[PDB]
Amino acid sequence: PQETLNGGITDMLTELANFEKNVSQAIHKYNAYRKAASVIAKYPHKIKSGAEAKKLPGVGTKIAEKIDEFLATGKLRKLEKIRQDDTSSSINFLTRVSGIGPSAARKFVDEGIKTLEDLRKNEDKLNHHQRIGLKYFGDFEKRIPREEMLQMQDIVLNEVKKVDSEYIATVCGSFRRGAESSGDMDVLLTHPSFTSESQPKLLHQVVEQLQKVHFITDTLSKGETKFMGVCQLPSKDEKEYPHRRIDIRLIPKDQYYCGVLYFTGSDIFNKNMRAHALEKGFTINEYTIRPLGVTGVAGEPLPVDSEKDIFDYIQWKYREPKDRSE
DNA sequence: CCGACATCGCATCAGC
DNA sequence: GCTGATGCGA
DNA sequence: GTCGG
Ligand SMILES: Cc1cn([C@H]2C[C@H](O)[C@@H](COP(=O)(O)NP(=O)(O)OP(=O)(O)O)O2)c(=O)[nH]c1=O
Numbered sequence: 001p002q003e004t005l006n007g008g009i010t011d012m013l014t015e016l017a018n019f020e021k022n023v024s025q026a027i028h029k030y031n032a033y034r035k036a037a038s039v040i041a042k043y044p045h046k047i048k049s050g051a052e053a054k055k056l057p058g059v060g061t062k063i064a065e066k067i068d069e070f071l072a073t074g075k076l077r078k079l080e081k082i083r084q085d086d087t088s089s090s091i092n093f094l095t096r097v098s099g100i101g102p103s104a105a106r107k108f109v110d111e112g113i114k115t116l117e118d119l120r121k122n123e124d125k126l127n128h129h130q131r132i133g134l135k136y137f138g139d140f141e142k143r144i145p146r147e148e149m150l151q152m153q154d155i156v157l158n159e160v161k162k163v164d165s166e167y168i169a170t171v172c173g174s175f176r177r178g179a180e181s182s183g184d185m186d187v188l189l190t191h192p193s194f195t196s197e198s199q200p201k202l203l204h205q206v207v208e209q210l211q212k213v214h215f216i217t218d219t220l221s222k223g224e225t226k227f228m229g230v231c232q233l234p235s236k237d238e239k240e241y242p243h244r245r246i247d248i249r250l251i252p253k254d255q256y257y258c259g260v261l262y263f264t265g266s267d268i269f270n271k272n273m274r275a276h277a278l279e280k281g282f283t284i285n286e287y288t289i290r291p292l293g294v295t296g297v298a299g300e301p302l303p304v305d306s307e308k309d310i311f312d313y314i315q316w317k318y319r320e321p322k323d324r325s326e
Numbered sequence: 327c328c329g330a331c332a333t334c335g336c337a338t339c340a341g342c
Numbered sequence: 343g344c345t346g347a348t349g350c351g352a
Numbered sequence: 353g354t355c356g357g
Pocket residue numbers: 172173174175181182183184185186262263264265266267270352
């Protein structure tokens with residue numbers, strides 16, 4: 001349904017969600033508000049009262065009261081107030097820097113560091129991740145057109161095969177769902193020699209090669225199985241491209257398709273597919289699918305050699321990635 | 327009344 | 343030195 | 353904040 005229908009309400013709830021996570025440090029209120037915003041966004045009617053909204057799962061007494069005030073006044077007294085509040089609004093904003101969470105944002109503001117300009121004057125007080133997040137603040141909030149994603153995929157697949165032709169690399173996330181644009185790039189990686197019981201260099205080799213051809217420009221974090229970094233397409237006369245976020249995960253061969261499924265998403269799709277994993281005694285994480293015991297204890301991971309099989313367990317017929325927005 | 331609310335890899339801190 | 347706890351992003 | 357044991 002159109003955003004115009006209840007966009008005022010869902011915007012209100014989303015904003016309330018952010019202040020709970022970032023300022024109050026209340027992650028479960030954050031999720032509570034997001035759940036309510038999500039169920040209202042789908043509601044195919046213009047809400048006329050808080051009582052009407054309360055019928056929806058996730059909308060309770062308090063949010064009903066808030067909707068009634070919003071409907072009556074076009075605003076929320078509490079939200080207007082915290083908006084004007086220099087301390088809280090500065091804390092909330094600083095968390096938009098990748099690496100600065102609710103705790104670090106609080107500490108910065110506590111000592112008078114409230115803006116991007118303040119952060120730029122105080123590099124000594126930032127860790128490696130936070131410096132990169134600051135350096136590319138604007139770029140990291142930009143979206144990536146599918147055309148650039150395809151160009152980015154071309155490079156990753158080419159360099160990965162160049163290192164070792166037995167590698168298998170899959171770009172997942174919103175890209176795999178065929179989305180017209182993405183927020184970042186999620187790469188899943190595997191190799192015939194790495195399974196449930198087996199170098200740390202398997203991931204390193206790839207990262208290093210992508211650095212060699214000057215695709216990967218910065219590193220946020222890098223372990224034996226998980227890389228988080230920054231990349232950039234080569235210049236065109238044309239201006240240069242924005243720097244983008246890219247993750248690369250090395251996953252055991254015998255867990256690849258659970259991984260591919262999990263990190264393809266969507267969030268809301270996985271949340272739904274997991275809920276019905278329960279439906280008839282299955283549990284699914286990013287590694288395995290397991291049967292639940294007679295009293296709810298998961299047993300042995302089952303064999304999986306395709307996304308298909310994971311569907312052949314909870315008894316749901318295959319959904320193409322393009323249909324997994326929900 | 328009151329506990330659950332998703333989970334995991336990596337960087338960094340708290341402390342022995 | 344080290345192990346364990348916490349912050350963080352996805 | 354919501355839900356339910
Ligand atoms: C944010 C998030 C994502 N995921 C999973 C589902 C996502 O589909 C997948 C990748 O995360 P993402 O890159 O933030 N989401 P996306 O790739 O579908 O969409 P976008 O274009 O990156 O915004 O990882 C979680 O399991 N827990 C999370 O908190």
